[model samples]
Target: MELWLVRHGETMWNREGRLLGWTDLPLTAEGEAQARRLKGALPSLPAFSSDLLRARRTAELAGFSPRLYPELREIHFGALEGALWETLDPRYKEALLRFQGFHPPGGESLSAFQERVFRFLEGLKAPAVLFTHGGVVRAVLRALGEDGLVPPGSAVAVDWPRRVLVRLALD
Candidate 1:
């Protein structure tokens, strides 16, 4: 089975460097255009996504009918939603820096996020496309035993908006 992951198109918060957290935001004009372009380039695969609009739109544009999973939503940022890092409280910043394990103020920890993602993966059938967030992709990759990869949003497209084919041998 292969897991094809796709990140949502750009958003106003993405362009403005604002923390999106759970705040619902629509795709900008440019982002919509990007999605449309991506839709035209889609490969044949079944898709699924969090209930978020961004991922849903990406799925639609990519020409994939996606099944909505509320459990697959992006990590909630809690108090930091819609706020920029520079504008966040100093205590919040310190807490984040010292958050070695997975605990965040009011958001999901890395561990919890990983658990949900892995559980979802295990429940899925083969040859599927996941229209999700970058964080979710990172968690899925980690669960799949990939290493040396940075968290999502830390880099440009992580070879996404394309199909990722994986072969699993059941011995």
Candidate 2:
């Protein structure tokens, strides 16, 4: 099945470089505009999204009332919920930059987080659109032998489990 994965639009906290995971925040005005543009750019389809406010708002602004699931949320950042990356303590900062096998205090391990995302993808019955987060996009890409980020309000369509089909930057 095909999957169109989208990173939710920017938030004020995002612009300020704060780490936000599991902490629900609404989209900024710019973010809402981005979502509107995204809606105009994509094809109509079934949609799903992280239960977080930012993601949910993105889907709504993008003209899709998506099915919501916590499994689609960004990695839970634990104690670093609103901390700026620049000021993060070296130990946790190093682990984050390394991008594998790190789990902040009270947070999920990288492996388990990947498992949760993959598990959600495995249950898809058909082609669908997903309004999610940058971290989720990176996980999917990494699993498919790719690694990177997607801009907020942007999208990538992939063949199930692997294979990048199309990448759209609709800011």
Candidate 3:
């Protein structure tokens, strides 16, 4: 399956370098602008989104009325939501940085998060665009042995569970 994983644009949380998981924040002005840039950048394929405000707004601004799915949401950060990245406990910080052994208090576990994301991808019937969070994109890319660092509002395309195709970023 072909998958285009779009990381929703920047939010205040993003600008502040805070943990943003299931916080439901809206995008910033630059975020909206980035989304607009994607209007012509992405392929006109069947589209889906994470159902979060940021992701849904990105899809809408990018000229797609996508089917929304919670399965595409960022890992629920639980009590850690909105925590500044620099102030995070070393244990929590290491888990996130390594993308392993992650189990935030009152939040979803890394294993569980991966399961849900992969499950959603497995159910895809064809090539499609996914307006989702950065974590979701990272999980997919890291699973395929890539570094998984992308800019806000950027997109990465891959042959699902396989190699990366391309990455698109609009300035």
Candidate 4:
């Protein structure tokens, strides 16, 4: 079984460096173009994606209508949604540092987010393409027990389109 995890293209918030967790923003024009390019690069495979418009748009632009799954949506950032890092209160950053697994008010915790991603992956029948956010991809990678990937941001391939084939080996 193999799973190809693809991150959605950029959005307006992405251009502004804002936190867009569960914001449901659409793809920017450039993002759409990127999706088109990714579509051209993809091999034929069963595709799945979060029900968000951004992911759906990417899938559509990529020449494939993905099977929608609400469970695959990006992490909910709560009060931090749509806010830029600079504008965020210092406490928020402190909270993140203190408890990496903590969720902002009204948001989903990192552990919960990971559990959801794990459940989704566990239920999958192999050889699939999943269009989602970088967070989801990271969660899946962690669940699979792989390491050495870069952190959430920090020069990571967070917003860029990616193709990762996950082959699960049950011991």
Lowest-scoring 10 consecutive residues by lDDT in candidate 4?
151-160
Candidate 3: worst 10 consecutive residues by lDDT? 161-170
Residue 45 accuracy (lDDT) in model 2: 83
In candidate 4, what are the lDDT values of residues 61-149, reduced to their tens digit? 87887899988898899877887867777777665444355678888887788778778877876567778886776665554444423
- Candidate with the larger lDDT of 3 and 4: 3
Clashing pairs in 2: none
Q: What is the C-alpha RMSD of each candidate to the true structure, in Å?
A: 6.9, 1.2, 0.5, 6.9
Q: Could you tally the backbone clashes for each prediction?
A: 1, 0, 0, 0
- TM-scores of the models, in the order given: 0.74, 0.95, 0.99, 0.78
Cα error, residue 128 of model 4, in Å, equals: 0.5
Q: Which pairs of residues clash in candidate 1, taking residues 3 or more apart in a chain or in different chains?
A: 39-61
Model 1: residue 20 alpha-carbon error in angstroms: 1.7
Q: Which candidate number maximizes TM-score?
A: 3
Better of 2 and 4 by lDDT: 2
lDDT of each: 0.62, 0.88, 0.95, 0.69
Per-residue lDDT tens digits of candidate 3, residues 66-161? 999999999999899999999999999999999999998899999999999999999999999999999999999999999988998999999998
Q: Per-residue alpha-carbon lDDT of model 2 for 1-117, expressed as tens digits?
A: 689999999998878999988888999999998888887677688899999999999999999999999999999988888999899998878877767767888878778888999
Which pairs clash (backbone N, Cα, C closer than 3 Å) in model 3?
none
> Which stretches of candidate 4 lie above 4 Å from their native place?
89-91, 94-99, 142-171
